[PDB]
Amino acid sequence: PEAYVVAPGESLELQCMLKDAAVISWTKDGVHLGPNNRTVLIGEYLQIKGATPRDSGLYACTAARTVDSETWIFMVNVTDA
Amino acid sequence: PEAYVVAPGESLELQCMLAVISWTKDGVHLGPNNRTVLIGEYLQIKGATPRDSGLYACTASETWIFMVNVTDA
């Protein structure tokens, strides 16, 4: 679990992994993340523009396929510090 | 984020911490089934297969998180 500092207003960008036939699902603090006006999920990428401090949290992407289900975690701290 | 490694075939058991507990895996809400039992603060899934791995999380505000790794390693 690696740390990511994002300055408020900037873009949080996370990248999961490349596995053939694996569809990527994202969580923040265990809760599900999907697409919205500030959230885009594409390929193995997660983008959130307009970082605010409550965007801070423990993000994780799980690449699941039928055979297996591998997982990466990112600790995101959105701060002016 | 707590680590839990289980060997395939064995029983995956999670125990929540610090109220009625609801479990998610990779964001999806879990209920009981023929290999899953949810009781008290416990989550049990028997017959672990590598696809049972994922990011589990238990909540009642407060939330506790588990990275489950099912491997023979």
From Swiss-Prot, chain B:
PTM annotation, UniProt: Autophosphorylated. Binding of FGF family members together with heparan sulfate proteoglycan or heparin promotes receptor dimerization and autophosphorylation on tyrosine residues. Autophosphorylation occurs in trans between the two FGFR molecules present in the dimer. N-glycosylated in the endoplasmic reticulum. The N-glycan chains undergo further maturation to an Endo H-resistant form in the Golgi apparatus.
Domain of life, source organism: Eukaryota
Ig-like C2-type domain mapped to chain residues: 1-71
Traits of the deletion mutant: Embryonic lethality shortly after implantation, due to trophoblast defects, absence of a functional placenta, failure of limb bud formation, plus defects in lung branching and heart development.
Glycosylation sites: 34, 69
Disulfide cysteine pairs (residue numbers): 16-58
Locations listed in the record: Cell membrane; Golgi apparatus; Cytoplasmic vesicle
Chain's role: Tyrosine-protein kinase that acts as a cell-surface receptor for fibroblast growth factors and plays an essential role in the regulation of cell proliferation, differentiation, migration and apoptosis, and in the regulation of embryonic development. Required for normal embryonic patterning, trophoblast function, limb bud development, lung morphogenesis, osteogenesis and skin development. Plays an essential role in the regulation of osteoblast differentiation, proliferation and apoptosis, and is required for normal skeleton development.
Domain notes: The second and third Ig-like domains directly interact with fibroblast growth factors (FGF) and heparan sulfate proteoglycans. Alternative splicing events affecting the third Ig-like domain are crucial for ligand selectivity.
Assembly with partners or alone: Monomer. Homodimer after ligand binding. Interacts predominantly with FGF1 and FGF2, but can also interact with FGF3, FGF4, FGF6, FGF7, FGF8, FGF9, FGF10, FGF17, FGF18 and FGF22 (in vitro). Ligand specificity is determined by tissue-specific expression of isoforms, and differences in the third Ig-like domain are crucial for ligand specificity. Affinity for fibroblast growth factors (FGFs) is increased by heparan sulfate glycosaminoglycans that function as coreceptors. Likewise, KLB increases the affinity for FGF19 and FGF21. Interacts with PLCG1. Interacts with GRB2 and PAK4.
Protein family according to the UniProt entry: Belongs to the protein kinase superfamily. Tyr protein kinase family. Fibroblast growth factor receptor subfamily.
Protein name, entry field: Fibroblast growth factor receptor 2
Species per Swiss-Prot/TrEMBL record: Mus musculus
